[PDB]
């Protein structure tokens, strides 16, 4: 419980900003690997834009 408690708000915070970040992007992020995929997509889009 202590461990979970120590990790309780952090997880929630992790979700919270994530949601905002998930909302900041048109695509909704659902998985860590999906997050990495979106990130590398963003890198490629940035490279093409530059």
């Amino acid at each position: 419980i202590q461990s979970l408690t120590a990790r309780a708000p952090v997880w929630l915070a992790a979700q919270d900003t994530l949601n905002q970040l998930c909302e900041q992007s048109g695509e909704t992020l659902a998985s860590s690997n999906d997050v990495t995929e979106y990130m590398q997509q963003l890198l490629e889009r940035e490279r093409e834009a530059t």
């Binding site: 860590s32 997050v35 990495t36 995929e37 990130m39 590398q40 997509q41 890198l43 490279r47």
Partner: protein
């Protein structure tokens, strides 16, 4: 003869562009597959302990 050197320099520049592009693409792919555990702790030492 003059344009020979121009072509050589252009070839070097084109190869450099290609190398940079290849490195960028490798890094992009890497991060796509790699960020999840990048710079994370070594399990081996922990398991030995």
């Amino acid at each position: 003869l003059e344009r020979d050197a121009l072509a050589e320099r252009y070839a070097t520049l084109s190869f450099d562009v290609q190398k940079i592009q290849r490195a960028h693409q490798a890094f992009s792919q890497f991060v796509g597959k790699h960020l999840s555990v990048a710079f994370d702790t070594d399990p081996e030492a922990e398991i030995r302990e």
